[PDB]
Swiss-Prot record:
The C-terminal propeptide is autocleaved. Glycans are attached at residues 356, 517. The chain holds residues 111 to 731 of 731 of the full protein. One of its GO terms (biological process) is proteolysis. This is Cucumisin. It catalyses: Hydrolysis of proteins with broad specificity. It is found in: Secreted. Its EC number is 3.4.21.25. The active site is at residues 30, 94, 415. The keyword Hydrolase applies.
């Protein structure tokens, strides 16, 4: 967050409705919260809003304050697992990180052993936080998620941040998250939900409810790298969150130190104890594979460092030993070096950063649509920074497998982009306190910055409407509004659901002719006239009627019909509709797919 907000064009000095923001409550359903974090200090805060009805559990030495005004925990139907501690306290770290990303106060000199040094903060530093612990070492059960929703809605939260999700698609009314969020929506409470980390294949997201704001994860300009310099002077740019100081060590290949009963064929990967523990003590081992902190403890005990490799390095992770993930070619160069001299060595440097001009790009793991339940409703809905985010961390929770002297941690996931969107949606709410969940969501989607389909060919099924743009979302001009009824209304076709985007499923090479009805509501007091601008690939005939709309003022509503005709050869074809009065730009992508 020391860079993400700035990257989004949301500096520390953005305008704010402080009194309103100070009375908004952000509900966070996660692994609980660590109250001692600097991000949750309450100096200067006034008492909890009169509307607040939530309570504060005291188990496990927990104490609420004027910042964290609510703290609950749920663990229905089974005994706790090793590592779990009854109470609302965050012993995992995930909930403290997401909560601080959404509403953490400004914390200067925020860093992880110097990495990412700057001022950390959430979208709404003045907002109150109500934590609901529903995730434990055995996961987050349907029963607890629903328990949290039942209380949160009644307690008075204004918005919900949910960085959790199911692995497989389920029908809305036999899905705890869909059910809870639906009832939250009927009470005017929006839920920002992570899309999932099961990408990059199509059909991997389970955040399918139309009423949910589903969020993908994308990169930012800052990128952590870990330079590795072998003995001959060659320098390779690897990827990892490496906090260890530079140091020269002897180098060794897993291929040349097979463990008992193993041979070069498998020892080259270093996994499953395939490398001789006696031949790698105090050395940097070269492994032709990539793995996590667990494997380090399982097969590499004794090593001074580890060099891994992978074809996918669009995000960095921390490890229990100095390490870096090298590109295959650099791994090959390292091996040639090893066999070019009798005593090879290398130095793994402490991580540094580079500027990636391609950002934002949806990251490899971000879950992709189409919507498995309602294939005509595009998912995910939008993208935000979810790669290498620095935010609050419990001083006792491990980082990369081990305990370290830090109050912050750098991690990636749609669980990191979700709270950025929560912070932004909340900021929008401070300026438009009467808006419905659908309206707030519409604002973020119609002002989202278009992303490059050449860097993410899956297009809308990877990033939805695009990259979130905070300052533009505050005043969208017009919104595609909706309420509980619309989601269960019978007209009830699907192409008539007033959604901020248009989705159509067809067959390849065949011709089609479908139409969508929509209604725009002006959210600005000044009147103006909008004209429609359509951009469609060859082979498609897209038109809107009317193609001009005038709004007389705040709340004025105008309907229109969109007709799409033609055929497609590829799996995904993208087009777009933009309504503009010269001041506002209301963009809705149109996606045609032949995927089944
Ligand atoms: C600046 O950021 C960009 C975006 O993250 C980096 O480019 C990406 O690099 C990764 C490797 O870490 C590439 O991953 C391979 O992806 C292919 C499949 O590609 C196709 O599908 C993906 C979606 O899954 C689309 O995004 C692509 O456009 C394409 O349609 C897969 O078969 C491989 O097994 C890898 O997973 C990724 O494709 C690439 N994205 C783009 C848009 O280029 C970029 O990384 C540098 O450039 C790439 C090409 C590699 O040479 C890296 O080693 C380089 O580091 C990064 N730049 C820097 C300097 O870090
Ligand atoms: C597209 O959805 C619109 C939802 O607002 C429909 O218009 C609304 O129709 C209501 C009648 O059931 C009427 O009370 C509302 O005032 C009106 N909303 C506004 C202000 O536009 C629209 O229905 C058609 O168009 C309206 C103007 C009437 O002529 C209806 O009889 C039409 O069916 C929907 N368009 C479609 C797909 O027909
Ligand atoms: Cl208690
Ligand atoms: Cl128990």
């Amino acid at each position: 967050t020391t860079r993400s907000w700035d990257f989004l064009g949301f500096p520390l000095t953005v305008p704010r409705r402080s009194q309103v923001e100070s009375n908004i409550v952000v509900g966070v359903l996660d692994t609980g919260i660590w109250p001692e974090s600097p991000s949750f200090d309450d100096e200067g805060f006034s008492p909890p809003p009169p509307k607040w009805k939530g309570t504060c559990e005291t188990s496990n030495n927990f104490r609420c304050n004027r910042k964290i005004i609510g703290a609950r925990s749920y663990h229905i139907g089974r005994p706790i697992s090793p590592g779990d501690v009854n109470g609302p306290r965050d012993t995992n770290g995930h909930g403290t990180h997401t909560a601080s990303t959404a509403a953490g106060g400004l914390v200067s000199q925020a860093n992880l052993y110097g990495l990412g040094l700057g001022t950390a903060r959430g979208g709404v530093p003045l907002a109150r936080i109500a934590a609901y612990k529903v995730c434990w070492n055995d996961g987050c059960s349907d029963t607890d998620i629903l328990a949290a929703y039942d209380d949160a809605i009644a307690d008075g939260v204004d918005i919900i941040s949910l960085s959790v999700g199911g692995a497989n698609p389920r029908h809305y009314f036999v899905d705890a998250i869909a059910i809870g969020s639906f009832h939250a929506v009927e009470r005017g409470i929006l839920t920002s939900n992570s899309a999932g980390n099961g990408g990059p294949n199509f059909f991997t997201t389970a955040s399918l409810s139309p009423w949910l704001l589903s969020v993908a994860a994308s990169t930012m300009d800052r990128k952590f790298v870990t330079q590795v310099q072998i003995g001959n002077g060659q320098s390779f740019q690897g990827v990892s969150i490496n906090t260890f100081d530079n140091q020269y060590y002897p180098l060794v290949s897993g291929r040349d130190i097979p463990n008992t009963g193993f041979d070069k064929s498998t020892s080259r990967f270093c996994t499953d104890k395939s490398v001789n523990p006696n031949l790698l003590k105090g050395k940097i081992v070269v492994c032709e594979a990539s793995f996590g902190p667990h494997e380090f403890f399982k097969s590499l005990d004794g090593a001074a460092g580890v060099l891994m490799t992978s074809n996918t390095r669009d995000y960095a992770d921390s490890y229990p030993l100095p390490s870096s993930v090298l590109d295959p070619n650099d791994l090959l160069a390292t091996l040639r070096y090893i066999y070019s001299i009798r005593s090879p060595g290398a130095t793994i440097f402490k991580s540094t950063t580079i500027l990636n001009a391609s950002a934002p790009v949806v990251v490899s793991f971000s879950s992709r649509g189409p919507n498995r339940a309602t294939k005509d409703v595009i998912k995910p809905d939008i993208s935000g920074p979810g790669v290498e985010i620095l935010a609050a961390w419990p001083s006792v929770a491990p980082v990369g497998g081990i305990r370290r002297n830090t109050l912050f941690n750098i991690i990636s996931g749609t669980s990191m982009s979700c709270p950025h969107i929560t912070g932004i949606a909340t900021y929008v709410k401070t300026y438009n306190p009467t808006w419905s969940p659908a309206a707030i969501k519409s604002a973020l989607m119609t002002t989202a910055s278009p992303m490059n389909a050449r860097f993410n060919p899956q297009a809308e099924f990877a990033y939805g409407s695009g990259h979130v743009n905070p300052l533009k979302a505050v005043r969208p001009g017009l919104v595609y509004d909706a309420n509980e009824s619309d989601y269960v209304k019978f007209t009830g076709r699907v192409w008539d659901l007033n959604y901020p985007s248009f989705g159509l499923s067809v067959s390849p090479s065949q011709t089609f002719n479908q139409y969508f009805n929509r209604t725009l509501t002006s959210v600005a007091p000044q009147a103006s006239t909008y004209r429609a601008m359509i951009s469609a690939p060859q082979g498609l005939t897209i038109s809107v009627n009317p193609n001009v709309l005038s709004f007389n003022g705040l709340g004025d509503r105008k309907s229109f019909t969109l007709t799409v005709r033609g055929s497609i050869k590829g799996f995904v074809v993208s087009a777009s509709l933009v309504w503009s009065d010269g001041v506002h730009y209301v963009r809705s992508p149109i996606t045609i797919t032949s995927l089944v």
